[PDB]
Amino acid sequence: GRECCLEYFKGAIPLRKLKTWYQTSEDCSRDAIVFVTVQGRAICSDPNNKRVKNAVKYLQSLE
Amino acid sequence: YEEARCACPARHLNNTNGTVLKLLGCHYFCNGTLCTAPDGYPCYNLTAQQVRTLTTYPNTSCAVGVCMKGTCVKNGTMEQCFKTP
């Protein structure tokens, strides 16, 4: 459905724990990149954070 | 990351205008925990009867609100709201 993030996770996610990523709806109050771990957790992240953009590049570079 | 307990995305309700997606109430579920939306977060304040009428099309006149300490405080604006798909 229409998933939106209400809180960002401000810490670091080990890239080895990451499975995939997606972006929440443009109609959400807060823009967010959602990271999905290997355990299945969905973690909301600030797209403005440099670590977040680098994590997406890493997951994209796996193709 | 234990403090990331409440940093998971939650499903919001849709509207017919071009306005922000709003949470039903001011609480959401994340990773086995009951979470509270931040103060100021857009929300809908529905009655239990209204929640029972929620479908996937605008069949409900929903009271728009703003989250304050876990309570959706109405601002006086109405919006047709519904669940996705």
Numbering used by the authors:
A (entry chain B): 7 to 69
B (entry chain A): 17 to 101
What does the study report here?
Evasins are chemokine-binding proteins from tick saliva, whose application as anti-inflammatory therapeutics will require manipulation of their chemokine target selectivity. Here we describe subclass A3 evasins, which are unique to the tick genus Amblyomma and distinguished from “classical” class A1 evasins by an additional disulfide bond near the chemokine recognition interface. The A3 evasin EVA-AAM1001 (EVA-A) bound to CC chemokines and inhibited their receptor activation. Structures of chemokine-bound EVA-A revealed a deep hydrophobic pocket, unique to A3 evasins, that interacts with the residue immediately following the CC motif of the chemokine.
To understand how class A3 evasins achieve chemokine binding and inhibition, we purified and crystallised complexes of EVA-A bound to human CCL7, CCL11, CCL16 and CCL17, and solved their structures at resolutions of 1.51–2.01 Å. All four structures display the same fold and 1:1 stoichiometry. EVA-A displays a rigid core structure comprised of seven β-strands and one α-helix, stabilised and interconnected by five disulfide bonds. In the EVA-A:chemokine structures, the side chain of the chemokine CC + 1 residue (Tyr in CCL7; Phe in CCL11, Leu in CCL16 and CCL17) sits in a deep hydrophobic pocket within the evasin structure, possibly enabling the ~35° rotation of the chemokine relative to its position in class A1 evasin complexes. Previously, structures have been reported for the class A1 evasin EVA-P974 (hereafter abbreviated to EVA-P) bound to CCL7 and CCL17. Comparison of these to our structures of EVA-A bound to the same chemokines enabled us to identify similarities and distinctive aspects of chemokine recognition by class A3 evasins. On the other hand, there is a consistent ~35° rotation of the chemokine between the available class A1 and class A3 evasin-bound structures, suggesting that class A3 evasins enable closer interactions with the N-loop region of the chemokine. Moreover, the inter-chain positions between CCL17 and EVA-A exhibited less variability than that between CCL17 and EVA-P, suggesting a more stable complex formed between CCL17 and EVA-A. This is consistent with EVA-A forming high-occupancy hydrogen bonds with CCL17 residues Cys50 and Asp33, thus “clamping” each end of the CC motif region. However, upon binding to CCL17, EVA-A became more rigid (lower root-mean-square fluctuation (RMSF) values) than EVA-P. The observation that EVA-A is more flexible in the free state but more rigid in the chemokine-bound state, in comparison to EVA-P, is consistent with EVA-A forming tighter interactions. This is further supported by the lower flexibility of CCL17 and the increased frequency of high-occupancy hydrogen bonds for the class A3 evasin:chemokine complex.
